[PDB]
Design a protein around this ligand. Sequence first.
Ligand SMILES: *[C@@H]1O[C@H](CO)[C@@H](O)[C@H](O)[C@H]1NC(C)=O
Lengths: 106, 122, 195
Amino acid sequence: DIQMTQSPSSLSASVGDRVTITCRASQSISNYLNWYQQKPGKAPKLLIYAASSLQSGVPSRFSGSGSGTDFTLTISSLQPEDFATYYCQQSYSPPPTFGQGTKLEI
Amino acid sequence: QVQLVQSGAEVKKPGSSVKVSCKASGGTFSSYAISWVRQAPGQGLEWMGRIIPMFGIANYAQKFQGRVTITADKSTSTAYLELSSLRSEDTAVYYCARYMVTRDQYYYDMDVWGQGTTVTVS
Amino acid sequence: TNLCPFGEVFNATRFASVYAWNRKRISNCVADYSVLYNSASFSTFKCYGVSPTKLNDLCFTNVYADSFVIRGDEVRQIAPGQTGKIADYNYKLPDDFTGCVIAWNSNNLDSKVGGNYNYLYRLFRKSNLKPFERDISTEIYQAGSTPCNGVEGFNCYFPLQSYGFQPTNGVGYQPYRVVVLSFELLHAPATVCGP
Ligand SMILES: *[C@@H]1O[C@H](CO)[C@@H](O)[C@H](O)[C@H]1NC(C)=O
């Protein structure tokens, strides 16, 4: 059914840097999308459960945005906590396909 | 609060079926969905199927429908995936994860993930 | 001869949630309604076709105790004559009911520090339910020309929403248990009367 794509494949950064990432959807979504991160060889964790709504216990390092398609996620004052790979995922029609992922190098 | 804990790794001969499981702790399947996700090694995540243990209802993505079955026994707080006919291309890490299918008219926000099971062949 | 199960109806710690409302039935026994009216803890005893003090001297074909839990500020819905999510979709009493509704604050009994998602109410249906209809089906409710295929998404809803009974709830957000004692008279081959 729905398809996802997510850009770029990788970025370099520094501790305290500001960085932004994008995901795009092949049917429109009315902001039914989520974001996750996973550390190399460990379980994914959810950061955002709409365009912008942050999940509980997550630090203020993250924000998200979008409108029907072309969503983004941003890191402000980037940390070793943010070395993770990040995935978008649409929730608008099943199955809830995840993005290809993106890599941040500290 | 609720913490999923997940079955240890499964090594099996090609085609011969597999079984893996998740069980809750600090609670149970209180009308959550639990649903299964592949992390094939270095690929994107892929979604397999919903189950709502409170009702036993389950459904699958087209790619896995027929190959797989998922099931649960809520009184023992345990849900299972079992997969037949395996390793066409497959040796993924398998995750169970919950999402709160009664908390809002919003879904698939997987707020807690199992430890992950390696499932693989030789 | 025997004494009625009211002593257990008001002391079972496990109740179903309203979409799946429990029913228990009264027969061949002494129905002490009056000691219910002596209760310390109760928070409504509003009755229909009766006044509760006198009930003990009356005789009946059957009584049903129907029981469940509700968010307090919507307890008003349960009795006749008013639309609202419970009366519309979960538990509707007749045009001319006869019986009594008993309810009490249960936050000390029912709350959990996470919200107790074992408590559920239906909030979507294709039409409102008839008197004492019951429906534990949970197939996806559509909200557009999309055939939902029995799986959830945009315009495709799981029918049951949870109450989320936290300890940090105001007087009306708190969980109130309810029992509806539904009565019946007829030509009256009774096996239920009070002492
Ligand atoms: C319910 O339990 C209490 C406490 O044991 C008891 O006093 C009471 O008689 C029981 N029955 C009713 C109808 O309250």
